[PDB]
Design a protein around this ligand. Structure first.
Ligand SMILES: NC(=O)c1ccc[n+]([C@@H]2O[C@H](COP(=O)([O-])OP(=O)(O)OC[C@H]3O[C@@H](n4cnc5c(N)ncnc54)[C@H](OP(=O)(O)O)[C@@H]3O)[C@@H](O)[C@H]2O)c1
Ligand SMILES: NC(=O)c1ccc[n+]([C@@H]2O[C@H](COP(=O)([O-])OP(=O)(O)OC[C@H]3O[C@@H](n4cnc5c(N)ncnc54)[C@H](OP(=O)(O)O)[C@@H]3O)[C@@H](O)[C@H]2O)c1
Ligand SMILES: C[C@H](O)c1cccc(NC(=O)c2nn(Cc3ccc(F)cc3)c3c2CN(C(=O)c2ccc[nH]2)C[C@H]3C)c1
Ligand SMILES: C[C@H](O)c1cccc(NC(=O)c2nn(Cc3ccc(F)cc3)c3c2CN(C(=O)c2ccc[nH]2)C[C@H]3C)c1
Lengths: 399, 400
């Protein structure tokens, strides 16, 4: 019999990632793992047909069952509205899910030794996690003020942002709740423990002494109170850094740390965004949603619609599953599932490291103008190779 | 019969760059160029001894004489205070100078054909300038409305926007602003930088998210372009256009380079050889005043090796191009053809020397990879400077 993987929430998506998603389930997951699968179709046509109710249900299912794996979906714009004759310009599914669940998005690369990187010294992953606008034009002279009116009726506070004495300009207001900062802290500490690396927070608290100082203070208070003992047990630490110092140190590091950032296209140089997953980590320590860091790869899908050959990287999508299942295994103390998830990840890394890869990675190594057809495998060929290697890997582990 | 170079403000600095700075002056500049030199020692000990007055005098000298060339300097932190027994944690001299001069900092690489880059198609420089910046931030003790309001001086209206209704508990809030003048100065510097070089200009913004804040950058650039610069741009076969950040990178990654890039919000630039292959030039909006320096620090790790008598290989290219781009600007202001020629020739020699396979360790490591670098693949700081000195003499001899 297969591995009993338990309860997993699955979200089907759009275009090229939809094709790859089904191949991942068919060739890599279903042949080895049985799931109590809570499956939701977040394809654009179904979201339209259900008036986006399917997206809300999916979010609630993740809250209920703790483990979510999601395929990339189309975020509608005016162009998509015309393409699919949509009823409305539906909100980003990711945005709707994030609002219901809360949490912090962490991005982790899939490390392959033969794939060029920004700093050659980076041998371990650098897992980065990021935390309303209210801006307006100032047409002419006048005061911009920002006020705080306590809910308890005590005297309101008025700060002068700027008195425009001559000419116009622009002004802006921003905020951050302590609760959100607390969630951000908890998620970051939990992430550092689960992966087994040190955590760093970066802020500009020298300039924004009160705004960014709150982030520094809250992280320290929660660290010293709730996480310091557990960190020291694994030979791990937490320290605050200034953003300028943090980047300079990271560029001369070996990697292998969590970077909580207070504020994507840089990371695409590492092969592509096909080598980056995006995991939402909720502050409860229980709930996770995993997906690829890239979109639906529309350009590749158009070629697929015409019957032309495609070479789309399934790694990020594959690692959405493995990091989803790894969390599932951790929650249920499921040693068999834990091993399988690891095995699939290693198989994927090994296959690329042995010279079998999709065009994006071949282009990163050799340069796009220099890439020939013999340097890479198409989408189907690469999936077949992974499946063959997966079978061989699992047979070896049975000894 | 050396070249009469005119008035230049020069700032000496610290550690490894200080040593390289003097080599450049000794071997590359002074044998061929005489200057009415306004020299200021911004070494950390002298800044401390003068209570940072030298830094302020240096800034005022640049404002007066229009041309500054600056060596990298130590910015004090806690460790430096203890190292040099400092009186105070003195501010960044770069920060002090920028506050007095104003302007926008543009970063330009030194292009060598045998040095790998992000996109092999890049043959021309992509010169990026960021908008230079206080805000009013505060603690929100508990629940309640945080609102931001505008009241024109004429009293004809009052607009109030909800920043956030704090319901759960406390947190933080802040107000930020920008005067049109600051945006206007950022535009003028960008257009003047584009005219000084032979390149088109592009402004990039996040106009999708903050439609109004970034919208006024887009509008002011376009207005100033049409009223004051368009005909000069058309006269030099160049243009100005606006882009969104995500579109600008895509165009940049498929282009051959060769454009100015105004950006409203660095480390990825280190991949191209090193920070030794990039300058930082503060361009004031008046078009006259510039301050040039290397886009790296004092290279402390190399200085420590030098103090122990160990061999060093520090790239002087950025420091050299601070001088050449500084002197090129001096020449432009004074209509000095001989100085203009010298500046360009020194740049050519520097590029030609590297392209012929004579380079410091950082560039050899960038090409081959650090673990594959042998001693025969690169030259010493001093060997490289000597090699540049020899090629410079030959370059200038053949011209005469
Ligand atoms: N749910 C999400 O996480 C998410 C995030 C962003 C966007 N989207 C959605 O995705 C749709 C298309 O967005 P987009 O095309 O701008 O972004 P994208 O789907 O990430 O594709 C952008 C480009 O990056 C490269 N690329 C990305 N993923 C790749 C992979 N797995 N293998 C090989 N190359 C890859 C391709 O470059 P080449 O063209 O050079 O091959 C591709 O054309 C949009 O409707 C958008 O709403 C979804
Ligand atoms: N005035 C300024 O513009 C400025 C700017 C930044 C920093 N600083 C000051 O400089 C001091 C040291 O800063 P830092 O060491 O953090 O940064 P840095 O001086 O720029 O050097 C950092 C590292 O980058 C590499 N590098 C930089 N310039 C190089 C060159 N010309 N040739 C070869 N390699 C080069 C070296 O790497 P390897 O170690 O791998 O050889 C070096 O250790 C600090 O006191 C800081 O205040 C000044
Ligand atoms: C030469 C190559 O083609 C190339 C060129 C230009 C850029 C890249 N991209 C990266 O290597 C890359 N960029 N980022 C984004 C980032 C960079 C610098 C920052 F200060 C903050 C964020 C990241 C990575 C890699 N990466 C790894 O953790 C990681 C992959 C393997 C070893 N470690 C995740 C992430 C940190 C590649
Ligand atoms: C393979 C090599 O080791 C390597 C790996 C990873 C990164 C690099 N870095 C660069 O080549 C580089 N990065 N930046 C920063 C930047 C990149 C992309 C953006 F959209 C915005 C900023 C820049 C450059 C080069 N460069 C040139 O202008 C330029 C060098 C030659 C031809 N043109 C200045 C600057 C633009 C190199």
């Amino acid at each position: 019999k297969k591995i009993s993987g338990g309860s997993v929430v699955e979200m089907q998506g759009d275009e090229m990632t939809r094709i790859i998603w089904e191949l991942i389930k068919e060739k890599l997951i279903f042949p080895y793992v049985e799931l109590d699968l809570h499956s939701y179709d977040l394809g654009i046509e179904n979201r339209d047909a259900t008036n986006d109710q399917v997206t809300k249900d999916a979010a609630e299912a993740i809250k209920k069952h703790n483990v979510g794996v999601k395929c990339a979906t189309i975020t509608p714009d005016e162009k998509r509205v015309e393409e699919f004759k949509l009823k409305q310009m539906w909100k980003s599914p990711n945005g709707t899910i994030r609002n219901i669940l809360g949490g912090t998005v962490f991005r982790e690369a899939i490390i392959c030794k033969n794939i060029p990187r920004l700093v050659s010294g980076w041998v371990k992953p650098i897992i980065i996690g990021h935390h309303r606008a209210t801006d307006f034009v100032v047409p002419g002279p006048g005061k911009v003020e920002i006020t705080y009116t306590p809910s308890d009726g005590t005297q309101k506070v008025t700060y002068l942002v700027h008195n425009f004495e001559e000419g116009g300009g622009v002004a802006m207001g921003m905020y951050n709740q302590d609760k959100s900062i607390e969630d951000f802290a908890h998620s970051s500490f939990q992430m550092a423990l689960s992966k087994g690396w040190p955590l760093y927070l970066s802020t500009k608290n020298t300039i924004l002494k009160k705004y960014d100082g709150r982030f520094k203070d809250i992280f320290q208070e929660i660290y010293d109170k709730q996480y310091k003992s557990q960190f020291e047990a694994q030979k791990i630490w937490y320290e605050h850094r200034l953003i300028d110092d943090m980047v300079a140190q990271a560029m001369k590091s070996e990697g292998g740390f969590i970077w909580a950032c207070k504020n994507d296209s840089v990371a695409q140089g590492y092969g592509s965004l096909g080598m980056m997953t995006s995991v939402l980590v909720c502050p409860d320590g229980k709930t996770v949603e995993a997906e690829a860091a890239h979109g639906t790869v529309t350009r590749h899908y158009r070629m697929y619609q015409k019957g032309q050959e495609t070479s789309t990287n399934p790694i990020a999508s594959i690692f959405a599953w493995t990091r989803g299942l790894a969390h599932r295994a951790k929650l249920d103390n499921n040693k068999e599932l834990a091993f399988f998830a690891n095995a699939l990840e290693e198989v994927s890394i090994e296959t690329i490291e042995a010279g079998f890869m999709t065009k994006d990675l071949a282009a990163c190594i050799k340069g796009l103008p220099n890439v020939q057809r013999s340097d890479y495998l198409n989408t189907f060929e690469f999936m077949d190779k992974l499946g063959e290697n997966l079978k061989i890997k699992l047979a070896q582990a049975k000894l």
